[PDB]
Amino acid sequence: SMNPPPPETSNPNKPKRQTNQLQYLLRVVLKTLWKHQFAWPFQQPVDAVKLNLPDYYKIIKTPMDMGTIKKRLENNYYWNAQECIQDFNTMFTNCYIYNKPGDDIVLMAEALEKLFLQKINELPTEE
Ligand SMILES: CN1Cc2cc(S(=O)(=O)N3CCCC3)ccc2NC1=O
Numbered sequence: 001s002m003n004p005p006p007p008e009t010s011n012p013n014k015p016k017r018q019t020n021q022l023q024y025l026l027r028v029v030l031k032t033l034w035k036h037q038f039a040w041p042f043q044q045p046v047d048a049v050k051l052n053l054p055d056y057y058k059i060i061k062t063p064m065d066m067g068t069i070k071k072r073l074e075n076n077y078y079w080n081a082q083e084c085i086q087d088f089n090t091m092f093t094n095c096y097i098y099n100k101p102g103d104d105i106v107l108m109a110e111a112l113e114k115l116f117l118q119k120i121n122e123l124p125t126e127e
Contacts, residue, residue, distance in 0.1 A: 004057055006045045007064060009071035014079075020127045021081035026073040029119045034066060036115065038108035042066045042091060059098055064090040081123065088116055 033039055044067040048056035057063070069087050071077075078084050095109040 001049050001054065003045065003048055004063070007068045008077075009068060010075045010077055014077065016076040017079045018076055019081060021123055022073065022076075022078055022084065024124055025081055025084050026070075029116065029123075030066065030070055030073060032119055033112055033116060034070065036112060038111050039066065041105060041108060042112065053098075056098060060094045062090055063094065064088075066091065081126075085120060092116075 034043070042065055045063060045065050046053065046056055046060070048054060064087050069084060069091075072087070073084065092109050092113045095105060099106050
């Protein structure tokens with residue numbers, strides 16, 4: 001009963017960049033989702049141990065969560081916005097794959113994904 005190491009949030013060898021799109025992702029997209037009533041189960045890596053989901057990391061081999069995304073943004077881990085958008089999508093997809101439809105957690109992810117899509121609809125053109 002161990003969790004895996006969480007996804008990296010910094011890497012000495014990975015080129016780093018600030019873009020206006022990455023700024024929007026932190027200041028508008030992540031900020032909006034982070035403070036949502038349904039954010040909290042997504043604010044850190046899935047703790048398969050504490051949540052008693054022993055098969056979680058047998059099924060989900062590409063874990064992701066908003067805690068991780070938040071640190072990546074803050075750390076300037078990403079080169080581009082598409083990397084960050086991909087992380088959000090992974091987090092939602094993992095949830096839909098692992099959990100039963102009608103579980104509360106699935107309803108929560110669906111609400112946050114709708115808001116995410118609303119906010120990324122207006123991602124500004126890059127400068
Ligand atoms: C992302 N999660 C975390 C999670 C949390 C929890 S719970 O029991 O904390 N809970 C019930 C709904 C609100 C939060 C249960 C399952 C998952 N599955 C994931 O897919």
